[PDB]
Amino acid sequence: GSQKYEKLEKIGEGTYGTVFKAKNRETHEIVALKRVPSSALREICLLKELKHKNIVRLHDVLHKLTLVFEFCDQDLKKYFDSCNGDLDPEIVKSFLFQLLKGLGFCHSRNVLHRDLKPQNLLINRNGELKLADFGLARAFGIPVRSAEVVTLWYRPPDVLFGAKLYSTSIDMWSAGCIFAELANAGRPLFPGNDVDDQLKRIFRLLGTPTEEQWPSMTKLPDYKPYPMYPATTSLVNVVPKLNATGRDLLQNLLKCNPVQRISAEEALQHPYFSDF
Numbered sequence: 001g002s003q004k005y006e007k008l009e010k011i012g013e014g015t016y017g018t019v020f021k022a023k024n025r026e027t028h029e030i031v032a033l034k035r036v037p038s039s040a041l042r043e044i045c046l047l048k049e050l051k052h053k054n055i056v057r058l059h060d061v062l063h064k065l066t067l068v069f070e071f072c073d074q075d076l077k078k079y080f081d082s083c084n085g086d087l088d089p090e091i092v093k094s095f096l097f098q099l100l101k102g103l104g105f106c107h108s109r110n111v112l113h114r115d116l117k118p119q120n121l122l123i124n125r126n127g128e129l130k131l132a133d134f135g136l137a138r139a140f141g142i143p144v145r146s147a148e149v150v151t152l153w154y155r156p157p158d159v160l161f162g163a164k165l166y167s168t169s170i171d172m173w174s175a176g177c178i179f180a181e182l183a184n185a186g187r188p189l190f191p192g193n194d195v196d197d198q199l200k201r202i203f204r205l206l207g208t209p210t211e212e213q214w215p216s217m218t219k220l221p222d223y224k225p226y227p228m229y230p231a232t233t234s235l236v237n238v239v240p241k242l243n244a245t246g247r248d249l250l251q252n253l254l255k256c257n258p259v260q261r262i263s264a265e266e267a268l269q270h271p272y273f274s275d276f
């Protein structure tokens, strides 16, 4: 059963516990093991139905509850640490393409991830990217239980303003943040100190949304009127290594109003991926 696996090292933290690199004692296969709740039950329920090359594979469940996953050598945070500077623009494109393919697959099946960040993206030695950690995910946008939301830096303006409900638009904002991070050698786009600082960094770059751009903004549970910062002329200053077509895609992912954010399917059709 559980003792069939030898724990090798602690590799992470999920939404509900610790992740270990482990070895199957009978076969010597290397796996990622999560030992432990609603987050575990939800992850099993979703992953039994979400099979895609850009989604982490759930191999087995042992009953203590043990979840046996596919092993990847790094998460994107570790990948960035090892890159220690600019990523090759082709790797930037490949990793974004794969992330959007995985997200596209989820969204077409009415699943939003809700916890998209570099620690939840796995990178294997063949340059393949996988989405992991579906413990906060929602099916049909239905809340399962909770204040539990994605870490501050990847939170969209609607969520920062207290929206409790959202569509797959939540993941497209996080994808835009990760795209800027990929293009910037792992440097975060909006590394806010708290909610107020997060909203200020977002609006200072993109501009504070007008009534015309976002009519319902004023109705949000935690809405606060911010200074009307102008929309920065170009993203060339924040993503210097990203070409003009890349920056156009980035702008379409980073719309403050959730309804205006490009979908994963539309992003995959963007000219950025022309020669791919």
Ligand SMILES: NS(=O)(=O)c1cc(-c2nc3ccccc3s2)cs1
Binding pocket: 011, 012, 013, 014, 019, 032, 034, 056, 069, 070, 071, 072, 073, 074, 075, 078, 079, 119, 122, 132, 133
């Ligand atoms: N932090 S790290 O050592 O680069 C690293 C983390 C991982 C993870 N694998 C999985 C699999 C499933 C769920 C979460 C994680 S986190 C694989 S390598």
